[PDB]
Amino acid sequence: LDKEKINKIIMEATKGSRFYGNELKKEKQVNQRIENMMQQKAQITSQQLRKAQLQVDRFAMELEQSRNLSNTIVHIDMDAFYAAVEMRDNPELKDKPIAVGSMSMLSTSNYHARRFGVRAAMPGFIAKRLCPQLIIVPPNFDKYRAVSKEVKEILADYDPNFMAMSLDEAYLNITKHLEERQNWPEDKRRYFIKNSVVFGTSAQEVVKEIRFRIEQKTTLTASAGIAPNTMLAKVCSDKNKPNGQYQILPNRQAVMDFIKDLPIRKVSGIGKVTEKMLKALGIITCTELYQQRALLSLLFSETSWHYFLHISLGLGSTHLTRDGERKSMSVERTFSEINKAEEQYSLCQELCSELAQDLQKERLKGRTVTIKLKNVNFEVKTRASTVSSVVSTAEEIFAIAKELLKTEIDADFPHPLRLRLMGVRISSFPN
Template sequence: MQGFDAAKINEIIRKASEGSRFYQHKQQAQQKLDAKIKEMLHTAQQMSPQLLEKATKKMEAVALECEAGRDLSRTIVHVDMDMFYAAVEMRDQPNLKDVPMAVGGNSMLSTSNYIARKFGVRAGMPGFIARQLCPALVLVPPNFSKYKAVSRVVEQVFAIYDPNYAMMSLDEAYLDITDYMEANADAYQAKSEVDNETLAEAIVREMRLKIQEATQLTASAGIAANTRLAKVCSDLNKPNGQYYLPSDTRAIMDFINKLPIRKISGIGNVTEQQLKALGITLCGQIRPNYGLLRLLFSDCSLDYFVRISLGLGETDLSNYTSGEQKSISTETTFTGTSCKQKLMQMVSDLSIELHGDMKKKGLVGKLVTLKTKTVNFVLKTRSMALGEPTSDPEVMGKVARKLLIAEMEKCPVDEPLSLRLLGVRMSNLSEEASSGRAKQTTISKMFEKQTVSAGRESSSNYCLVTESVAREVQAFHD
């Protein structure tokens, strides 16, 4: 079964989505970005050499400070399970191993196997477009309880090498194996010499083998001096491979200078297009353009660009694992619908699921947030604060439904709110009292001392919550 080249894949996607709300949304977003890039280039043309030189010196000063803090003392590993959800389904249903398959539905795919990827099928793609690319594609509904169970088995392997490993999702984690290497160097010395590999490589190869033995699934890994580099490296020898980048400044700079900017986590399509417009396609081209970047991008982006250009990243995994959890959420995507009954039921179901996750972690929260995405791909969040913390699904569901009703009431009768994504989040978290007598909000008092706030829309504008929310709250309170 032959795949398609990139040009044909893009043409099929264009034809399949042309005229759809998805296509219109993408076009509008691209038009806004094109206008922003045009304005950015115009601004760049007006910059004097003196202004650029001054800005460059300031950025170089930041770079010198960052370089002084370079830490090459730790060995960081990023482990990424190969096509995790799809691999679990293929393991449990062997008939799927030799056919193009994806996990998800017509609205959205979570992942796909490598056979399907040859046809351009990717995570985040609507299923109906994926089937245009690959008519033989088999869609499997996701089973997250099963994926979580497999992930826990993988975590048991991680704990052998780093008890303080940092799980970033169900299928990826960071580990600091420095201490394990020091404690077990002698045990691996003979093996690493025979295989002509470093101690770190031998340990990570063994780790990946243990994962495969425990789950019948493969994992890829990157080994480097920090999390940013390790994550990039884990993608270089996929699937079922690993890549080692020596913890040496010269080796790191040689590596980073040749690296395409899109390979860096955090640089998405928008930033990539902006940087490409400035002639920056490789990480090594960032430093020669320090001055330009300082004058065109926000302050919060500058340190990020400097650290990328130097190949710097996090070396302390406690920054990922320590501290209180700030929020906990669950969401679902579906075929667009404006049916009030269906949407309300989804919110209730999400609240029950969220309650289960919170109970497992012993958490309660005081701020309920409803997340919505319309069929036109407009993303919004709306929040309501409670008087007391809770994890009660009835309370969370009641509040979330009130927020949803408020959004519905803003729409004209002949154009009802039509959604394709719903999510419920709890924040302002605290631990539930171990005695079980935590003072939790109940239905009868959940609107005491409450406030309502608007979340951020995809247009980056902040809006006040409509009066309809206040009316709903007051009616319930009365």
């Protein structure tokens, strides 16, 4: 299906739903927030622009002088992960458009199915109108967890302090390994086919060995970026996907040529909204994000343009900080409509139990409790409450969440809360 009929059936199948109501309502807030930003752009003077241009470029120099090309960062990323796993272990599904999910939602889809526009975060029933030969197949998370464990075993040989960002993804710092690998015999870097193969001394070659070894161990392909920092590496991981690599060599000129024409969306952390907002200023590539740096220092907060300047100069993180301790834990469930008050309490109590069980497993006790309610028109509320002494057991949590939900049914009274999702989150853990 073509790049016009896709958008045409999505609209055809979304039109007039309670969900699409809420999507239009979210679109206005965004367009308004843009309209407000264009009001500010109108009332920015020339003297302010030149006043900022100096202050920004004083900081840009502070960044540029401390640029760091000494480290070799790799990003590994599995291809069509949940789909690949399901394809691997069910031969029939190969050479056929699949998607892991339910009719309600799709985690992912394989590349065959992506040519019909079916993608991650699409509902099933829409993906079936886009492609009636789509086989939707339920997720087996425990397999995907097991498979991930198999790749993390390989990745640990190259950087034992690697950073598993997810099941399917990971940042590595292979700098220490590249120095050690320079003077290794062919015995230490030979691998047999599941008949023998050796891999070189270069970084390209280390990553070719890694990707090779994953394929022997899991029968799954992965893609990989190479670059002097994490931000770049993540983007060149996407470059030659599926089943490929890219290296941005460690020199300023090579960094900048890659950056030069790079759409800002492809940077991790710039998403749908930011793209549309910056696009209203005529910024689509990374060089344009640089040119407009001064203007941006006035329209956006300090950290937000501090980020945009790192992006424009091709900069990012150059050492992986061993994943820190969590700030919150949560559980939430979607269902067909609930509206009787006593059911909603029962349901909350159940969530507060699961959340207590989970805390039990990691031994954590928090001070803040936060319910989340989403009604049949997809309008989300969040209601929170922080307490002196920490809490942890199913009763203590429920005690607090009960009252927050009381306030909500009582506020809409005499009308009932017609809700489709409920959640409970605990936060404010100790030092």
